[PDB]
Design a protein around this ligand. Structure first.
Ligand code: PC1
Ligand code: PC1
Ligand code: ZMP
Ligand code: SF4
Lengths: 156, 82, 98, 110, 114
């Protein structure tokens, strides 16, 4: 029709603007923060993708849980997640944030950050290389690209 | 705090505000443990209600010796002029 | 007399009535006092520019500077009051009844 | 006249951008969110040093207000008096600064 | 049979420390309900403090109740000084947990455990 075409082009516009301007709030929990720092370092360089370095949590677009989520800090994780404006996204980086990892059977470790926050991209590795974290960021951008917000709005 | 009568009426009003004490059996010389059926923690929150009402601190080695409202009003009379 | 001068005098008397009926705060008193100073600046300026009286054009600036320094003094007094009571309430300033 | 039109156009563009910045994402039906920082329920303690630097700004700003007609006062015929009073005002600003120095007024925000 | 004490020489000073700890928790429940903006009442929090004191009431050892008063003062210090969050205070109120079956027959119906 006509309105289907209009909402499809405006979906393309807002999806382009959101995926090409992702601002991350990186939780520097553990060793995966070092490899996020290498993903911001000149060789891999997140900033040329529109992915800025260390955005503040009250304007950031994607939360990167990089490291081990323990039981003492899981309420702080959910608090910073609740303080993020929508559309917020969660990238889980590394094995301890994915499922508990090397500390899975520990008394003090949250077995996966997806027990706390809704997680969009699971980045595997211990740590995943910065190239692989960048692969997860680009896969998140392709997930944002195929969103259908105004199409489902026009169809509901 | 002026007369013993105002202090006695205010002691009985505090102990009838408290829900677990039955106000029918509540008298002036009623014992807390064997008569009113109160735990020791009940007696201690009674003493803290007395501190909230009368406006001063009651120590520990003399709140253990407050087992009836008569000794409470006699203690407040001893710690005031009346 | 004239019209716009009557308006600036009306503003001066309105900020005077606000300066003579205290509600809660000392900062409200200082604000009404400086609204009075503002209206004095405006009315002096319109008179001095109206008559083309040249040497008095430095007068409103003088009328500003001193009185702004005066306001600074008032602010410092408020601060010392707010360092004793925690608020700038005028009802905390009643110890001199006796 | 042109100045008032320009101020009105700048104010209209400012209010229009603020109104677009508030009403355009409120088209979204995103989520009504709940559960409301370095203090949780602490009051504000006053700091004397911030008030001292504010009043120091105000007093030196008054001294600057006196110093402002100097590019016009350079054109006068009594240049000896004008030079003496210009140097006297800047010297009194410097004496106010030295008194702010030596009485520890410029400390912990020096 | 002769041991070194911690703070109390007998159960008199031990019950004194228990009693003053209960006094401090009773004074701290309304502030805890206020500043943590909890969804409980003050009477409900005092019922929980009563339950936490009557849970350990059967202890006849003065050193054990000395350490229980010490750990209660640590819980009190984490509550007064705002070190606990809202979650750490609501963990005493087992709200998301379903109530466990207490009789024999429903425990028989649901599983293998006594
Ligand atoms: C010049 C500087 C830049 C100017 C601004 C950028 C230009 C484009 C501005 C319009 C962009 C598109 C509309 C805003 C984004 C909407 C995104 C969204 O979530 O939409 C779903 C929303 C709601 O979708 P929903 O019904 O699925 O709700 C989602 C929320 N739940 C499911 C929980 C209830 O759609 C709308 O509100 C419709 C908005 C208008 C659609 C287009 C109409 C024509 C506009 C011209
Ligand atoms: C301390 C004060 C230092 C400055 C003193 C005045 C210097 C000056 O310019 O004087 C000439 C000026 C003016 O002289 P003049 O040289 O400008 O005169 C030319 C005539 N007119 C002004 C019309 C252009 O002042 C006087 O002669 C008298 C005023 C100052 C009197 C002494 C004030 C002392 C204050 C102490 C507090
Ligand atoms: C918000 C909620 C927060 C919950 C607060 C948690 C506080 C937990 C503190 C725990 C401290 C204790 O359990 S010490 C209590 C153990 N005491 C004993 O075993 C000695 C016996 N004590 C008692 O019987 C006590 O009831 C009394 C009051 C001392 C005496 O009573 P008896 O007379 O009958
Ligand atoms: S997944 Fe492994 S390497 Fe990565 S932060 Fe965790 S412990 Fe460190």
């Amino acid at each position: 029709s006509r309105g289907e075409y209009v909402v499809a082009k405006l979906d393309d516009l807002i999806n382009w603007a959101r995926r090409s301007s992702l601002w991350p709030m990186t939780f520097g929990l553990a060793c995966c923060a070092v490899e996020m720092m290498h993903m911001a370092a000149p060789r891999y360089d997140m900033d040329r993708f529109g992915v800025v370095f260390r955005a503040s949590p009250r304007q950031s677009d994607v939360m990167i849980v990089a490291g081990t989520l323990t039981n003492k800090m899981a309420p702080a994780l959910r608090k910073v997640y609740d303080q993020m404006p929508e559309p917020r996204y969660v990238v889980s980086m590394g094995s301890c944030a994915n499922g508990g990892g090397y500390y899975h059977y520990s008394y003090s470790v949250v077995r996966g950050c997806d027990r706390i926050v809704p997680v969009d991209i699971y980045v595997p590795g211990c740590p995943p290389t910065a190239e692989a974290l960048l692969y997860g960021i680009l896969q998140l951008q392709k997930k944002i690209k195929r969103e259908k917000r105004l199409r489902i709005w026009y169809r509901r | 705090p002026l007369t013993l009568e105002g202090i006695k009426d205010r002691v009985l009003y505090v102990l009838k505000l408290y829900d677990k004490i039955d106000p029918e059996k509540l008298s002036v010389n009623s014992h807390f443990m064997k008569d009113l059926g109160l735990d020791s923690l009940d007696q201690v929150e009674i003493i803290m209600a007395m501190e909230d009402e009368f406006g001063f601190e009651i120590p520990d080695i003399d709140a253990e010796k407050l087992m009836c409202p008569q000794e409470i009003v006699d203690y407040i009379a001893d710690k005031k002029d009346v | 007399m004239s019209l716009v001068y009557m308006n600036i005098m009306m503003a001066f008397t309105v900020s005077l009535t606000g300066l003579l009926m205290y509600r809660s705060h000392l900062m409200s008193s200082l604000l009404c006092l400086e609204g009075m100073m503002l209206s004095l600046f405006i009315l002096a300026t319109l008179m001095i520019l109206n008559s083309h009286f040249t040497l008095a054009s430095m007068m409103p600036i003088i009328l500003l500077v001193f009185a702004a320094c005066e306001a600074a003094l008032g602010l410092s007094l408020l601060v010392m009051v707010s360092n004793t009571y925690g608020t700038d309430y005028v009802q905390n300033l009643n110890l001199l009844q006796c | 006249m042109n100045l008032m039109i320009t101020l009105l156009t700048n104010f209209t563009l400012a209010t229009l951008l603020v109104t677009i910045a508030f009403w355009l994402p409120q088209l979204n039906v995103y989520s009504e969110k709940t559960s409301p920082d370095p203090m949780g329920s602490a009051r504000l303690p006053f700091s004397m040093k911030f008030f001292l630097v504010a009043i120091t700004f105000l007093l030196f700003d008054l001294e600057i207000a006196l110093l402002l007609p100097l590019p016009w006062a350079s054109q006068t015929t009594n240049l000896n008096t004008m030079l003496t009073m210009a140097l006297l005002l800047i010297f009194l600003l410097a004496v106010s600064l030295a008194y702010e120095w030596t009485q520890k007024g410029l400390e912990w925000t020096e | 049979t002769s041991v070194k004490p911690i703070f109390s020489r007998d159960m008199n000073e031990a019950k004194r420390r228990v009693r003053e700890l209960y006094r401090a928790w009773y004074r701290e429940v309304p502030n805890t309900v206020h500043l943590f903006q909890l969804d409980i009442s003050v009477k409900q929090g005092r019922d929980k403090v009563r339950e936490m004191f009557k849970k350990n009431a059967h202890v006849t050892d003065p050193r054990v109740v000395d350490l229980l008063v010490i750990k209660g003062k640590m819980e009190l210090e984490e509550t007064i000084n705002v070190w606990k969050q809202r979650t750490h205070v609501m963990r005493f109120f087992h709200e998301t947990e379903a109530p466990r079956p207490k009789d024999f027959l429903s425990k028989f119906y649901v599983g293998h455990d006594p």
